[PDB]
Structure formats: C-alpha cells, structure tokens
Design a protein around this ligand. Structure first.
Ligand SMILES: O=C(COP(=O)(O)O)[C@H](O)[C@H](O)COP(=O)(O)O
Ligand SMILES: O=C(COP(=O)(O)O)[C@H](O)[C@H](O)COP(=O)(O)O
Ligand SMILES: O=C(COP(=O)(O)O)[C@H](O)[C@H](O)COP(=O)(O)O
Lengths: 123, 467, 467, 316, 151, 123
C-alpha cells in the first residue's frame, strides 16, 4: 500500500488528477468546448496560483479565485485553432504564469469547462 | 531591606505567628478553634492556618520578594487555650483588607475557609467567628430591603409575622398547593411558603405552582383585608433558571420569593439579592445544608459566620432555628447571632458565642425565621426569645390541625396575639405562657383543638454545640 | 384505600422504615452513617432521616391524602450496625426519581442533605454515598469536555499533565503574575493557574491579569512548541461577574478557565459548565471549602458525594487530593472516588468506601488534580496512584526551586517523564521510585537541585477519615 | 462560482461508521479523505450531537482538518456540518458556529427536522452565505410504495421551494431503490427552469420555476468506482457523487480511497468529452485508468463484482 | 482483540444478527415488520435493517477499529415470522442509548427510520413500535402541561 | 544556577524532555504499547512541525495538531518488529519529516501513547 504524497502535490481542479494532457488530448477538450457551443476564454495568473484568504474569511469568501483575463472571451469562435493559438500567444507573453482555458454557457451563465492549460516552471 | 532567597521549607511560625500585632480596623479577623495533631505546637498550628489561608505555601518561594509580604500576610496574633480541652486552642487570625474582592462572600470564604480545614497537621478546625470591617461591609448591598422596609411594604407592625411551609414536602400538584395556600392564608397567617425542596419536579412544575399560588394568595388577601405573601422558590440548577423564576414572580406582582443560599450558592444568591433590590421583591432565605457544616463543636463553621455572610450577600429573612423545636439550637448562642443579624452594633460577648464586636454601618437587618417542629404551646417561648422582629412558621403545626388549614392558621394567629397582648400588658411569657394559651382556648375553639392535639409534644435532647 | 385523617404525631417508622423494600433502578439511594441520641432506636433514627429529607414532617398532615404518599416517600430500606461502633449505623434511604428536579444538583442536595443533619434526635450524621440512577444522570450535561476531548484539544497523550499554582497566594501584581506564568510554562509545565483565592482584588484586578497571563502563555507556547494553558479564575461574587470573566477568557482564545464550585455554588457552577460547553472552554474545578464538610468521619458528607455532584454539574478537572502531600487523603478511599470520577461503571466496593455500584451512561470522565505539598520525590508515587489521566500540580514545588520558575518546571517535567519511561519499561514505581528519580538527577541539573532542596520533606500524619 | 469548481460532477464522502467516532477521529478521517481529491466530506445524517461526540467539538476539529486539506491540495474543500437538531434554537446555534468558522457548507435533514425549521435554516444560509446540503432521511417511509404515500418528486419540489443547495436524489445503481427514468425526471424538476409534462418519466404536469435556482442532486449509497461511468452519464456534471464506504473501505486508507474516486471520475469526464460512450465503454475507461493509477486499481480489485440489482417497487 | 482490516463486503448478519442478545434497559427497541425481496433470508434482512439504521454501511470500513463497534451497533436480537404471511417477519432491533441525541425526536427518527425503508433488498418495511428507555424519556420535556394540569 | 535556554528548544510532548531514545528504549516503548493491546499507528509531518493558528483562534482551536497518517493503524499487530519496520519505511520515504508513533485504545477512543520517533535534520 502506497501513502499519498504530501509535498508539492497541488492540484488544479478538473482533469488535474489525470496524466498530463497530450497535444491531442488538449485539442479534444477544446473541441468538446466548441462542439457544445460554449465561448472559450483564457485566464492567467502569476502571483497567486492557489486560493487563499487575505481580505476576509466569512463563509464562501476566498481570494485567489479571480485570475486575469487574456484579451476577451472568444465570442463566435468555431475554430479550435484560434483558441490554441491564443494559448500560445498567452504562453509567450506569460511563460511565468498558470494559464487555464474556460468555456462559458451564456444561457446558464456558468462555466461548463475549466482546465489548466499551462503551468510555469516547477509546477 | 531585601534578603536573599533561601529555597527550602521552614516553620510557618517564622512569618505567620505575630503575637505583638495590633489589628487594623480594616482587617477581617477570624476566630478559629484549632485542634492540632500530637506533636504540633499551638503557635505552628495557628501560623499554618494563617499562612495557607492567605499568602503562603509549604516551601519558600522567591516571588514573595516582588511584593511586600508583611503588608499582605494573614497573621495569627493571639492564641488562647480552650478550657477543659485537651489540645485545643482559639487562634485569632487577622487578614488585611486588600486580600478580599469587594462584595464577594465567595472570595472571603475561599480564602479563610478554603484549604486549611484539611491540613494533615490538624485533627480538627472550626471557624467560630469573623469580625467584618466596616470598610468591607460597605462593599456589599446587604439585604434587598431589611426589617424596616419589609414591615412598611407589608403594613405589618407590633407582633412577630406568621408563616407556614406547605406539606407534604414533595408530591403535591400545583392546584393542590394553591388550594392549601389559600386555606392557610385566609385563616390569619401572613405567609405560606414552598418547602425548600420544592423547586420544579415531575409532580409539580414551578410556573404552574407560581400561577396557582398567586391566585390563592390574592384570594385570601381580598377576603381578610391583610396583605399576604407566599414564598415562591426561585432556587434552581442554573442562574438562568433561577432568574426566570424571579422574573415570573415579578410579573405576578407578588411581594416575596425565596432562595436556598447554601445549596444554590453565594454567587447565585448575590445575583438574586441584587435582582430583588432592583425589582422590589422581598427575599426569604432558607439555610438548607447548614447543619452539615455547623453542627459539631470541633469541626466546621459556626452558623453565626454563615449568618453574617448571608446578611452581606443579601436576604430579607433567614431561617434561624427555633430553640424549642425539632432541630438543634441553644438559646444563648441563638440570641447572639439573632442580634448579629438584626442589629447595627454587637459587642463582643463570649457567653453568647460572640468573639468580636461587630458593626454594620447601617446594613439593613435580617428577620430571623423560627420554623421546625413548633406549635401553639411553643408560642410564648417563641415570642419571648425573638420578640416582634421575627417570622414564626408552622407547617405541620397548621396542616396538622384536625379541622383543616384555615382553623389551623386561626389557632396560631390567636395564640400569637394572645401572647402579644399578655406581654404588652406586663405578663411574664416565660412563667405565664401556659396560662396565656389556656385562657385563649376558652374563647377560641380553633386554638382549643390545636392545644388538644399537641399538649405534650416536646423536643428536648442534649445539644452538640454549646458555648 | 383512604383512611380517615388522624391528627397528631406518631413514629416516623410507621411510614418510613421499609426493610422489605426492593429499590427501583430509577431511585436515588443514600448511605447515611447515623449516630442516634441515647434512647433513639436505629429504626426510628433511619426513618426520621428518610421522612424529613423527602415528604414528611413532625406531625400528621391531612394533605398526604391528596397524594399517593407511598409513591413519593423516601424510605429507609436497610440498616446495618457499624463495626466497632458504639451506637452508630449505616441506614440506607431510597428516594423516588420524581422527587428531584432534572439537572439540578442544588435540588438533589436540598432534599437529601437539607435539614436532617440538625435533628435534635441525632448526635451526628454523615452522608457517605449516593447511587445516582442513570435516568437522573441523563438529565445533566456533565463535564463540558471530559478526559478524551481534553487530551484531543490539547494534543497531550501518554503521561499525567503538569500544573503549578502561582505563589504567593495573594499579593502579586498582574504583570508579575504573567512574568511568573511565562517562566513556569516555558520550562515544561502544561498549565499554570490562578490560586483559588485570586479572583479580583486591590493588588491585582482580574482583567489586567487575564490579559498579561494570555501574553505570557502564548509566549511560552511559541517558545516550546507545546500547547499551554493558564486557569483563569472566573469565580466571582455574582453570576454576572463570573460570566464577564468567562467571556473575556473566550475573547482571548485561551483553552481553560477555573471555578470554585463550592464557594461559588452549584447554581453558578452549572451556569458556567454550560457556558464552557457552549464556548469550547475547558473548566478546571477547585474544591475550596470541602474539608469544612468532608473531613470528619462522624459528621458531614464524604468527598465522594461532592465529587459525583461535580461530575453531574460539570467540570473537566477536579482537585482530588495528593494522598502523599500536605492535606489529608487516604489512598484506598482516594482510588475509589478517582474511579467514580473517571470511569463509566464502578461496582460496589466497601474496602474503598464505595457503597453503591454506580453507572454513568457515558457522562464524560473528570481528570483528578493532585496538588498540595508535593514535589519531585513524590512523582513516582503520584504517577502510580493516579496513572496518566490526572493533572499533577506543583506550585511551591516550582516557585520554590532555587534557580527560578523555568528550572523548577524542568525538574518536575523531567521527574514525571523519567517515571513514565520507567513504568513503561516495566519498572516498579513503588519499589524503584527513588532510584528512578536519582538516576535522572545524573543528567538533569535542574532535577538534581530540586532533589537537593526537598530530599527529606514528608507529610505523614494520622488520618481522620478512614474506611 | 463560490467553490470555483466547473466541468465535472462534485465528489463527496460520508464519514463511517455512522455513529461511534470521536470528534478528533472524525477530523482525522475528514482530512485524509479531502487531501486525496474529494471536494467534500460530510457528517452522516444521524450524527447530530451525542455522548460519543458532541457537535461543537466536531465542527472545530473538522474545520481544522478541511483547512489543512485545502492548503495541501490547492482546491477549495468543504465538510457538511450537520445543523439538524431537536429545536430551532439548537439548530441555529450550529449554523451560527459554522458561520463563525468561515466554512462553506452545512447540512440539514429536511423531513426529520421538518419544513418549518428547514425554511428557517434556508433563509439563514441565504443571509450568511452558507451552502445548504439537504439530506432526505425518512423519505422512503413515505415514497416507496406505488399504491400509497407521496412520490419523491413532490418531496423534491417542496424542498426546492423551502430551500436547499443539494438534495440526496438516489443513485439508481446503488444499494437503495431508484428507477432511472423516474430519477431523470425529478432531477430535471430539481435543476431546470421548465419541464414539460412527460408521463414516461412520471411528470404529470409541466412545471415552470421563474428562475428559482436549481438544486444539485446528490447520488450516495452503495456506489463505488465501477459505477462511475453510469453515474457520470445519468447525472452529468451538475451532481455530487458521494462515496462513504467507497472511500473508507479502500484497502490503503482514506487518501488513496479518495484518489481512486477522483481519478475514476476524471477518467470518465475526459472520455465523455472525447466522445466516448460511457454506457458502452465504462468498464474500459475505468480499466485503462487502473493502468496508471495504483489507487484506482486497488479499489477496482476490491469491488469488481459488487452490484445491487433488485426488482423496483415503484415504477412508472 | 483487534483483528486486521479486511476490505470488501460481507453479510450484515455476520455483525448485526445477535439472537442471543439480552436487551439493556437503556436500549431503544424497535419492532419492524420486514417483507424481504425473494432470495433475501430473514436474518440478513433483519441484520441489514439493524446495520444501516445504526453504525454500518455496505462494505467494510477500517474506521470501525478506532471504536468499540459492539458497544454501539444496533442489533437484530429476535425474529418472529408473521402468521398468515407469505415472506414477512417481525424483526426486533436494539439500539444503545449512546446513539441518540438527548431530547431530539428528530435524531431518533433519523437513525431508526432514516434510510432502511428504501433498501433494494426489501419489498416493504413498517416500524410498528419503539420501546423508549426511561433514561431517554427523561431527556425530554414531554407535554407542556398534561392532563392534570390542563383540567 | 543555570538559565533555561530559549533558542532552538522546541519540545515534542511525551518523553521529549528525556535524553534521546536509544534503540532499546524505543523498542521498550513499542513493547509497552503492544503489551497494553493498543493499536500502533505512525504519523508524519513536514510542513508544520508545531502548533500554530492560521485559520481560527477561538478557545481550543489550533492548527498543526493533525499530522498525516502513514498507511493505516496497524490493527491486530502483536509484533514490535512490524512497527519498527514501518518506522524505517516511513523514514526512508520522509527523511524530511517529523515522525511519531501513537497507540490507540478503541475502548476509550483515546491515544494512550504518543512520542516522536524521528526528527529531520537540524532538530
Ligand atoms: O421543614 C420545615 C418546617 O416545617 P414544619 O413546621 O412542619 O416542621 C422548614 O421548611 C425548614 O426546613 C426549617 O429548617 P431551618 O429553620 O433549621 O432552616
Ligand atoms: O494551594 C494549592 C497548592 O499549592 P502548593 O503546590 O504550593 O502546595 C492549590 O491551589 C489548592 O489549594 C489545593 O487544595 P485541594 O487539591 O485539596 O483542593
Ligand atoms: O449512508 C449514506 C451513504 O454512505 P455509503 O456511501 O457508505 O453507502 C448517506 O449518508 C445517505 O444515507 C444516502 O441516502 P439517500 O441518498 O437515499 O438520501
């Protein structure tokens, strides 16, 4: 029996417990997002990669949830190549940041997708 | 000057036996009856008592040097051997005013009586008296009302007040309690009361009782034209519950509630005493558990100390014993603490067990309550022992009457007034008691019947605690 | 059927001596050591005790007929003569569940111990034990936390806990108190505590002390890496004041406060026990005044009754005596009530003074606290008498150390662990105690010095209360 | 949004044994579970306050435990602290202490506690930003038989009205009864804003909600890793899948038990997102994962042939 | 003594059917009219009911070892077949006092009647009676007044 | 007279004020645990070796009390060699952690034993 590790075992929500996404796997997630007609958007963060509580600790309040938007949500995008390209533009600009791809469903006004697409060195 | 710290244990007498000490008028003085173990000299016994009840412990601590120990230490300033006693002394201890929390009987007892009675070095220990300094007396509210205010609120003057504990002690329902209360009061008693163990129980919940008893007392009052009261017991398991009861009694507009200060405790009792002052409620105090503490002459705390403590914490009445009834109470000792309870100044008087002159700086006086195995034939002795300022209670002596509660009450009321009239006319209650009572039976069928029933019932046993 | 009312007095034994009675499992049973006055037969003595502590009075009252007296009456169901005693018996009394207010130790004592000890007909009376029915036990909260929860909150396991009362008892300022507290705790003690008579006084007001003591304990905790606590005393003159203190302690986020349950009282104590449960505060209970009540074998209430009452009202620790220290405490009797305090079931065992098998239906256990005239050389006996689940306190034994508080604490902590390690390795604490201690002095300068100072200090006197 | 969780069903776990654990052991079990990848742990429904563990002690230790797992993993964690109690006063004291602790979610048994107290708690939670997980203890006493009682869909609509953020909805494939078509029907009545009459799913009336928020259905009871594909497919992302025995029954402890469930779920989510058929490919999806997750493999080893298939009492 | 942890599921009857058990006077006793699904024996039906309404779940959990399960477990101590009934029994279950919150009918029902009526393995279930121990009765206020006070 | 040191004098509860345990001494503590029939368990911690208060400070609340469990409690263990071996396995895996041995009494549901068995470098 194994002992689940304790150090340097930070996770990133959805898909973060699976092996690293391959180009194909990443591609398939983008396809999934677009096939369901959700709006893709990229978010990046370099200062606070995980949730914390510096300004308040009442129920449901956490800091670190908001990351910063890369450009704007890609309204009307139907080409996964556009998403993947923006991911490359974001990476070259913020190689030091964690970058995630999210997908909005404006009818429900909920993100039906969210996964980490890039992690900076040592992560 | 400061001297180095020398670790280790040494005799307590080195610091705490101070035979040349003149007591300050701000000191709290204690008279302890000390019975040392064989081999333990009086000086060391008295010093161990002074030390451990104030500032010292078993070995030398360096921290004394941060303070001025002589300013704070309690000290045995006098020791007198007990006559006819084999290895027993009266050690007097003086405690500086600064050692006590203002207004807290709880703190006062915690120091003086907290750990010394369990000393391996002592066979037994009894606290006989405390001289409470007037500067400490003033930190207490004292009775919520006191004798003068109580007679004034009730418009009752010129005779002892009459009460009656409802019986059986436990087991009656709320409606039956009120029923019994109405019959008693309409007959001439001024009060009826919850038996001390009647708080709230499966057979009768308190609110139901408070409610029915209010209906009953208001009915007896309207019928007789005399103010009536029923001691509604607020004693409870928590301060919260106790307060709820005091609060409902206030809502009912009744004049008096009661509390068991020892089983309930000084902390809760003081809380109730203040509430009663704040809400105009008379507070009758019962002393359940006192004899567990004050019965034996060799060990414990004399009741006079428990009585002074109650006057400080606060209470308008306090059970004081009957002398002639079913429970123990020597006359001279009783007369002594009754004075300590009602008066403003009492001079030292060892024949009555008063070891210190005590002043009260106008703290209201407490009405002593005689209750327990007393009946009509005891009336002359009771009137003479206590005088007008007392409450005489007859539970069995009322609910044991052959004609019911109302006639039982009439019997007691007639007996008392007969004694009051006789006394006022110059008759000797002690010599003429039976004649005074007997004459009254000639015109009061109710008294006659009661007299018939209890004619030869006496309670005369050897006392355990004497002077 | 009902029989007419016959006014007048009759023997209590006619109704209250019931030798054929089989006790109900819901009854509260009492074992009274009765010493009757000459001429008073055991049956009437036991019956008078059963009657007056429950439903009866001195003469026959008609009101019994409104109830079912046999359903409510307390009754003497057994009498056993005391071996080697001249006119002394153990009378057993059974009290129906309905006679008591749920959750109120105050009511329980008011009935059982309220007026019977002052009976003229008795020379002396001692309540030795009470069998508390599990149906009554369940009406109480019991300790706010209890042994398991306390070790869990403090993350302390495998050894008795160590404490220390700050000395001198009275007289230290608030800053000096914190100073002394920090030095003690940083040395290895788990707790320090306000001496029981330290409440609020001219020399040190409580809030100032709470504040400085919090600064001190948090400093010792950060330095050592072990959770620390200081019993802040909430004992006060009124429930209000007591609560203010509990409230400030809560605000400070400290883990433990303390209360004097007897001088403060059961009503206030129960109020504090609930608050502590509601606010996650550990409650250390001191028993100031108990020896005034429980010292003598012939009269009073044995401590085991006062201990059971406290477990019901609620407390996480209770001073239980040291056996080997400066105050009285026989080993077999002590081991017996320690079991009554910590365990869930204790079978009747007269060799340890346990008159009734007692069950607790999971009421949390209370940690016994040994304090009073103990020092390093006593460690092996203390570890062996009490085992891990106890708190051993050394006030003078810490502040009396020649090198100061921190080394005084190290000495006690090293001595305890040395004994724990030895015991765990199979050594006999009783036979090997001095050797275990002596070996430790070889590597602990601090213990050596303490050992130097108290090597021949013993407290061995004849006990007043034996089995 | 409060939890910052999107794209997959949420994972929970009821601490076991149901009764009998101490407060510190509860927190200990809670920390191990959460650090492994579960989003929540929860008080078993009958854990309120008892001689073996008083509630405040549990709330306190569970807060220490969940905050520790959260800091370790980097994911928001929660533990449903049960506020169910004997009186409204007691219930409120518990909600109040949970608020003081700053934790995100509490729970209530709406039927045994009652609608009056439940509505009081629902409002308090709205007023204090606490998520409310609702357990349906006692419902089968009412809704099991087809001939007499009240169908669960009525009890579910009532709860959505009174108020609750989660509601136990059955597992379909687990140890307790729950037909798929009927379940899919009331799950829609719980999460959606409009549901057209559809007798094949037991929906007798078209129901509109005028934007009343949707409730997250919670599948719990006799489920384990092999059931993951069916659960993901029946409920979709908006559900909470709970594994108590399925986590604390793992041979390696709570943390690996949690990893197993978390890996199984994401494996199913990834497969589904890639176009695979959860119904046909479930066992293969799970099996593939065991190839790289020792934790899942062990769990799979333990529960490979455990099914719960009995005839239903209430059908359409 | 403690025995190792053996992961996996096993019959509830192994731990929860206790026909030799003498009930404690502090126990809460339940009389359940059990109608098992075909193939489910009375002992396992009664045991499943005792287990899931008290301390157990569907598979073996290691945490039982941190406690004293026999001290807490509810247990089917008797089973009597129903006369004239086809596959229906009266299974008696005993629940230790410690399992219930003092004064809370809500907690009592949540345990005894919380999840067992929905068991796939049972066709139907009815709770016919509960023997409420006097030690538990005393944790409740009961009627605010009652018959005597009301009159 | 000595002045009790102030720096680097962190302690570890039971037995931490005695000289370091020798192999024999450690062995005897394990024996003691097993002879009393308590269940042994190992716990390790590398991030927060001592109690602290980051998330709350109400009475009785402290962070740092919970460490992480090594495998599972050794139910039914009667061989001290098994415990000592697991201690070695834990040490090789977490040489950077503090490791303690605890012993459960399931009847009381209390740890009747707890002592530090290994401390990382500089401790
Ligand atoms: O029991 C009685 C008197 O009833 P009865 O008149 O029928 O004897 C009182 O309530 C107190 O207990 C007296 O005790 P004390 O005055 O010593 O406190
Ligand atoms: O005075 C001391 C001990 O100080 P030291 O350690 O210096 O003797 C304690 O505060 C209690 O009074 C003990 O009494 P008990 O344990 O009998 O309640
Ligand atoms: O007992 C469990 C599940 O534990 P396990 O995962 O070990 O089976 C849950 O707390 C609810 O009782 C489910 O019932 P429902 O979802 O029908 O309300």
């Amino acid at each position: 029996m194994q002992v689940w590790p304790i150090l340097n075992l930070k996770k990133y929500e959805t898909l973060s417990y699976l092996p690293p996404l391959t180009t194909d796997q990443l591609a398939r997630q983008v396809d999934y997002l677009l096939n369901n007609k959700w709006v893709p958007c990229l978010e990046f963060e370099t200062d606070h990669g995980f949730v914390y509580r510096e300004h308040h600790n009442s129920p449901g309040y956490y800091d670190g949830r908001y990351w910063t938007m890369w450009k704007l949500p890609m309204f009307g995008c139907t080409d996964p190549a556009q998403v993947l390209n923006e991911l490359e533009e974001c990476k070259k600009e913020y190689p030091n940041a964690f970058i995630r791809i999210i997908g909005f469903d404006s009818n429900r006004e909920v993100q039906c997708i969210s996964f980490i697409a890039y992690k900076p060195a040592g992560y | 000057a400061s001297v180095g710290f020398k670790a280790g244990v040494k005799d307590y007498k080195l610091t705490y036996y101070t035979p040349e000490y003149e007591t300050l008028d701000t000191d709290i003085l204690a008279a302890f009856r000390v019975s040392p173990q064989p081999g333990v000299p009086p000086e060391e016994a008295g010093a161990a008592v002074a030390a451990e009840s104030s500032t010292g412990t078993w070995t030398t601590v360096w921290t004394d040097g941060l303070t001025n120990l002589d300013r704070y230490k309690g000290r045995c300033y006098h020791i007198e051997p007990v006559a006819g006693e084999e290895n027993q002394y009266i050690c007097y201890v003086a405690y500086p005013l600064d050692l006590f929390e203002e207004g807290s009987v709880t703190n006062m007892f915690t120091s003086i009586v907290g750990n010394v009675f369990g000393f391996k070095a002592l066979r037994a220990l009894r606290l006989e008296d405390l001289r409470i300094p007037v500067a400490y007396v003033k930190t207490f509210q004292g009775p919520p009302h006191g004798i003068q205010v109580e007679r004034d609120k009730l418009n009752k003057y010129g005779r002892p007040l009459l009460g009656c504990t409802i019986k059986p002690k436990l087991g009656l329902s709320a409606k039956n309690y009120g029923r019994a209360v109405y019959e008693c009061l309409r007959g001439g008693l001024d009060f009826t009361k919850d038996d001390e163990n009647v708080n709230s129980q499966p057979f009768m919940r308190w609110r139901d009782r408070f409610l029915f008893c209010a209906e009953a007392l208001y009915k007896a009052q309207a019928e007789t034209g005399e103010i009536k009261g029923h001691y509604l017991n607020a004693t409870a398991g928590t301060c919260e519950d106790m307060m709820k009861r005091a609060v409902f009694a206030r809502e009912l507009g009744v004049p008096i509630v009661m509390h068991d200060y020892l089983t309930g405790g000084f902390t809760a009792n003081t809380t109730l005493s203040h509430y009663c002052r704040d809400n105009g409620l008379l507070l009758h105090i019962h002393r359940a558990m006192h004899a567990v503490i004050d019965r034996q002459k060799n060990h414990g705390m004399h009741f006079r100390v428990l009585a002074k403590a109650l006057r400080l914490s606060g209470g308008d009445h306090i059970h004081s014993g009957t002398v002639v009834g079913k429970l123990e109470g020597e006359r001279d000792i009783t007369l002594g603490f009754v004075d300590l309870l009602r008066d403003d100044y009492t001079e030292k008087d060892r024949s009555r067990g008063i070891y210190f002159t005590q002043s009260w700086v106008s703290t209201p006086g407490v009405l002593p309550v005689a209750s327990g195995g007393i009946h009509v034939w005891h009336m002359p002795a009771l009137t003479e022992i206590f005088g007008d300022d007392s409450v005489l209670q007859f539970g069995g002596g009322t609910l044991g009457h052959p004609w019911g509660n109302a006639p039982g009450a009439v019997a007691n009321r007639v007996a008392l007034e007969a004694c009051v009239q006789a006394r006022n006319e110059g008759r000797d209650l002690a010599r003429e008691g039976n004649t005074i009572i007997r004459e009254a039976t000639k015109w009061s069928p109710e008294l006659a019947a009661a007299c018939e029933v209890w004619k030869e019932i006496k309670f005369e046993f050897p006392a355990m605690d004497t002077v």
